[PDB]
Swiss-Prot record, chain A:
This is Furin. Ca(2+) 3 binds at residues 150, 193, 223. The gene is FURIN. GO terms for cellular component: cell surface; endoplasmic reticulum; endosome membrane; extracellular exosome; extracellular region; Golgi lumen; Golgi membrane; membrane. Residues 54-75 are annotated as: Disordered. Substrate binds at residues 46, 83-84, 128, 145-150, 156, 184-187, 198, 200, 260. The inhibition peptide, which plays the role of an intramolecular chaperone, is autocatalytically removed in the endoplasmic reticulum (ER) and remains non-covalently bound to furin as a potent autoinhibitor. Following transport to the trans Golgi, a second cleavage within the inhibition propeptide results in propeptide dissociation and furin activation. Phosphorylation is required for TGN localization of the endoprotease. In vivo, exists as di-, mono- and non-phosphorylated forms. Ca(2+) 1 binds at residues 7, 54, 97, 100, 102, 104. Seems to be expressed ubiquitously.
């Protein structure tokens, strides 16, 4: 019979297990025999305290590097303010050692854990690329709890080297199965930020993870967007419990917060899943997340049923990760077919936006061609437009099956007159739908101001396959 | 930028 951890703070890890069902169902995976053995996770952050008493036993120098100082040792820079504690906190959520009398346990408490020190300095495109591309035939899973500023007015994403690192990782990483990039969706909720304006979370190559509070609510810091895939628990108000993990200076903290805690927990669950089937591709892993994540008792006013009967929210994606279900479904999972890409240039002429613009287009999704898609995965609306006040725009995309994705919600602080330059707004909400038929793009001015602009390009980019659907 | 999270 499985014996749960004895660590002194494990009883405070409410999000891992419990009789209440407000948890990630991680103990069910442990009891099936999956604790992370043989999986390698790397935290891309401000360093990792490799000698921490709850990390040393799982630390892997092969999963670590210091890009800021250009050396192998990712040890954080110690300061009075403890600025460089972030990476160590993330690491303990993935792989804090179990049954050692110290703090709590990681989700994958037998996985190997490393860290890339890359935020403690000027974070250039090159810095990001060397971090994302570190030892990609040794590291299985990368966890990143950082990104562009959450001020609610930034539109920014990976530059050329970092985007190349993403494509090299998913194509050749992990022996050709593809690096698994897990991303925290953002902390810009107070600024009404949109995580589709963050190219790292909005990328198809990252599993973007949002947060839920203990009582099942959308935290104050949460960003809503269509690119989010799933959710894990994190912090909320001061009556709700928080996340227990390893802290800087060999300490234990019960006060880790934000989406920064959600990505590592997801990374740990994904590590358990990879142990259950090491042959899973980067796309397999996203399919598993879509199929097994649980909406139940997550509160949101935007829950919608997509075309294949799955509930999806812009706050939560497909809902809470379910570790037990993930590892169970992984074991006999059949690899998905190669990824197809269908490019559809929509516009025949530029369109003035004015108060409201609706663009309708019926598509065949590359019917009769090798990139014919009947089973959608990600869909992108790559938009080029000008507008006088970007944050007044709301943008929606409706799939032929009737699923309305919010690509962009109003951003009150985004005063920019720079518009969008071929920005690839991404939605996960039509996963497994047939993309043949009428797509509708809606652009509206959400303010009373007499705003003006022009949509000059709308490329609908469909990814997916043409085989292997299950019943809705 | 790149902010911690
Ligand atoms: Ca160093
Ligand atoms: Ca421990
Ligand atoms: Ca953001
Ligand atoms: Cl592509
Ligand atoms: Na490949
Ligand atoms: Na993503
Ligand atoms: Na159709």
């Amino acid at each position: 019979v499985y014996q749960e951890p004895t660590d002194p703070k494990f009883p405070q890890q409410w999000y891992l297990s419990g009789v209440t069902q407000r948890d990630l169902n991680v103990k069910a995976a442990w009891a099936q025999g999956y604790t992370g053995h043989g999986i390698v996770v790397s935290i891309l952050d401000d360093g990792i305290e490799k000698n921490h008493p709850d990390l040393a036993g799982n630390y892997d120098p092969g999963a670590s590097f210091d890009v800021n100082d250009q050396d192998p040792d990712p040890q954080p820079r110690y300061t009075q303010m403890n600025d460089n504690r972030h990476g160590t906190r993330c690491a303990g959520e993935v792989a804090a050692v179990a049954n050692n009398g110290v703090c709590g346990v990681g989700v994958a408490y037998n996985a190997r854990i490393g860290g890339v020190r890359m935020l403690d300095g000027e974070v250039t495109d090159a810095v990001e690329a060397r971090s994302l591309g570190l030892n990609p035939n040794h590291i299985h899973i990368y966890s990143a709890s950082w990104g562009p500023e959450d001020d609610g007015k930034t539109v920014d994403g990976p530059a050329r080297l970092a985007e190349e690192a993403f494509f090299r990782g998913v194509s050749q990483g992990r022996g050709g199965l593809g690096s698994i990039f897990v991303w925290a969706s953002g902390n810009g909720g107070r600024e009404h930020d949109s995580c589709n304006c963050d190219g790292y979370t909005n990328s198809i190559y990252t599993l973007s993870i949002s947060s839920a509070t203990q009582f099942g609510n959308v935290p104050w810091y949460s960003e809503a967007c269509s690119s989010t895939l799933a959710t894990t628990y994190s912090s909320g108000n001061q009556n709700e419990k928080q996340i227990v993990t390893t802290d800087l200076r060999q300490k234990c903290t019960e006060s880790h917060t934000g989406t920064s805690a959600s990505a590592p927990l997801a990374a740990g669950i994904i590590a358990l899943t990879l142990e259950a089937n090491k042959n899973l591709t980067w796309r397999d892993m996203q399919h598993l997340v879509v199929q097994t994540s649980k909406p139940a008792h997550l509160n949101a006013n935007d829950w919608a049923t997509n075309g294949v009967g799955r509930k999806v929210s812009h706050s939560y994606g497909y809902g809470l990760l379910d570790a037990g279900a993930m590892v169970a479904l992984a074991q006999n999972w059949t690899t998905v077919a190669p990824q197809r890409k269908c490019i559809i240039d929509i516009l025949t002429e530029p369109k003035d936006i004015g108060k409201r613009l609706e663009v309708r287009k019926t598509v065949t999704a590359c019917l009769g061609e090798p990139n014919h898609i009947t089973r959608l995965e990600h869909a992108q609306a790559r938009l080029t437009l000008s507008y006088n006040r970007r944050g007044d725009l709301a943008i929606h995309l409706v799939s032929p099956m009737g699923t309305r994705s919010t690509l962009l919600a109003a951003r009150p602080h985004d005063y920019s007159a720079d518009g969008f330059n071929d920005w690839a707004f991404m939605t996960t909400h039509s996963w497994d739908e047939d993309p043949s038929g009428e797509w509708v793009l809606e652009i509206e001015n959400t303010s009373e101001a007499n705003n003006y602009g022009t949509l000059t390009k709308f490329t609908l980019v469909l990814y997916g396959t043409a085989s292997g659907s299950l019943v809705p | 930028x790149x902010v911690x999270g």
